[PDB]
Design a protein around this ligand. Sequence first.
Ligand SMILES: C[C@@]1(c2cccc3ccccc23)C(=O)N(CCCn2ccnc2)C(=O)N1Cc1cccc(C#N)c1
Ligand SMILES: CC(C)=CCC/C(C)=C/CC/C(C)=C/COP(=O)(O)OP(=O)(O)O
Ligand SMILES: [Zn+2]
Lengths: 395, 314
Amino acid sequence: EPLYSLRPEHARERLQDDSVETVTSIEQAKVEEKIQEVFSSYKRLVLQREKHFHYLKRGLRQLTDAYECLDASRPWLCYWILHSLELLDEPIPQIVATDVCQFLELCQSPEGGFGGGPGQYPHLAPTYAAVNALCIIGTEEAYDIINREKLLQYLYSLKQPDGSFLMHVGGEVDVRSAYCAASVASLTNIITPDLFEGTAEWIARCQNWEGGIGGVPGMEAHGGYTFCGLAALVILKRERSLNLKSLLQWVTSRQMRFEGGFQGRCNKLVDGCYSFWQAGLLPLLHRALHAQGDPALSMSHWMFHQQALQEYILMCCQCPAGGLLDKPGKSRDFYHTCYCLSGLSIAQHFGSGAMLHDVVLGVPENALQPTHPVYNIGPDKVIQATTYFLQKPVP
Amino acid sequence: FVSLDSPSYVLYRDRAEWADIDPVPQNDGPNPVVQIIYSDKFRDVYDYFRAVLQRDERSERAFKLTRDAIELNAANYTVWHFRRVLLKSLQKDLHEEMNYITAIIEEQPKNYQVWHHRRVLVEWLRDPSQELEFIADILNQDAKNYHAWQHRQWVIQEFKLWDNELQYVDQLLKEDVRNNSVWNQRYFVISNTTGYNDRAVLEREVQYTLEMIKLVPHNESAWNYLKGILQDRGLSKYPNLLNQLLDLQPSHSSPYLIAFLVDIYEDMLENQCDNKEDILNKALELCEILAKEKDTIRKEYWRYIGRSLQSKHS
Ligand SMILES: C[C@@]1(c2cccc3ccccc23)C(=O)N(CCCn2ccnc2)C(=O)N1Cc1cccc(C#N)c1
Ligand SMILES: CC(C)=CCC/C(C)=C/CC/C(C)=C/COP(=O)(O)OP(=O)(O)O
Ligand SMILES: [Zn+2]
């Protein structure tokens, strides 16, 4: 058995509840059971591209009333889908692209930033989505939609005295915002000398006894927030402000020995979307630890089981009708599609200067297009985008 | 006025008192993208909201229309924002509102805006008297709800409510000792009360932690706590522990203890301890037992650790 998930010895990774029961062990055991059968069944892995393509293709234009809950997150819907079209290496028509630019323009506020959909107030989350969806498109038409002045003016209205930002005006605070502001401030070349004043230090108070990062200082270490903070620090170049060793021991601990995938926080359930939010953290650390001169870094692999993640995504996360999901028994959705596919791409491609070694389980068609660990958009989409705005003013 | 699920519910256009106001359609452009096929009941309420908003009709009726808009999509911050605009302007019973949000947070606990709203209310009233009790009820249905735990940490810190949180933690650990959110609440309380500098406190905690590990050796959360409360101050600073673990090796040696072990040596090779080489070998040996037999999922981690333990030590 060339599969880490399907050998006989691997069947030893099942949970050891030491004969004590809690709502946690029970649930952990229920996912493991369902994962067992999925594994079992199989005894080469293929990425149902076509099937996924149709799903993605349709979605991009229309959604059932099932998406009424994500009505205030439409730019997200764009990004998630466009990015999955990017990874699956599927060209975007100039009419599709333009209509996208047209849509994201009606979401853009007269004050800067973007809204969940046409006429909605500007919010950092959807703003991140648009600036990210605009760059995936890649044209001049795309880029030119961002009112680069207004953006910076908007980020400034959210900035707080402690270095933290608000999600939107009158909204809450958490590491997610600093990441949104950082990602859009960097791509569009609009970072003013005092923009992230005391930010790196705030994101830092968010790391806790666990080694990871919570939403706000004091909260439990979660994998979605941790990515948000470390990546923000990579942008601001303050990765050093965190105990990276504890962050590394933590994130690496988050991968499940049996399932193969990652959980969002210690002692919880495995999820396909964490294939990015968590595993994507490794490429980031690897970078910072390299910028420090660490001589012990592997030269071909990411500090996590790349084969196991892939095996979890390929055997347990694909939907027959298309799209990828959280875990078996969950209904497909575009967000888990975006991050399941983003995860996979990271699990297949290794970087570090000239050192490039790719792992690709299953067939060769399963290989996906790389993605920039800090923005989760094509590595080239980034170079191309920052370049364009660098050839622009700043103030 | 009439709830969205009530049998006799009527769309807003078919309503008398809403005749003077024209419904504003959503502007999605010529050829839309990710255009949701909203149901009729949905598109109705929002087409009317896009109205009272587009006018800024800070009216009492638009206040009622907000409940319905929030029901159909609690995640709409635009709507929620306008609900607070009207909340102020019309001077509504903030005490009646708490009652609302309590029911909403009860029916949609995993939503961001429901919780942020409740805060703004507690702030306005400068009254947290119902907080702990409420968050414990939500937590009773989901002990790990993040939004809950976050709101709970706010209350306490804001209104100095540390007094009973520890006992709360103890109760919940009883129910589920694998609850990592409660081990986090534990560190939270203490850190802002007695701190772990006090030897009596730190003392009590390690025993308790150890007892939990003994009781359920494979519960990673406890190990993490033990580590978190000792790590930064120096594992090498506490010799007994190193031994009190390598004395349970036969009857307990899960990958969690082996792993903690390596944690301890690494701190010794830091503060410089006798037999700097005897240790190194005790650590590398362990990294390979992990990266080869007991923690194969973390092989790329342990391979690096070993490599670093040399590289920088020697
Ligand atoms: C609902 C939301 C979410 C909403 C808006 C923006 C987000 C931006 C980043 C991450 C999550 C975001 C959100 O608050 N959480 C977090 C809580 C639930 N969760 C945690 C890990 N896996 C699921 C999401 O996972 N979202 C994504 C989601 C869930 C179900 C279907 C679809 C689709 N299509 C998307
Ligand atoms: C840039 C950006 C906006 C990033 C968001 C990243 C992310 C994945 C955030 C999730 C936060 C949260 C409320 C988790 C609780 O999830 P849960 O209780 O539903 O599930 P879990 O227990 O498995 O975490
Ligand atoms: Zn998920």
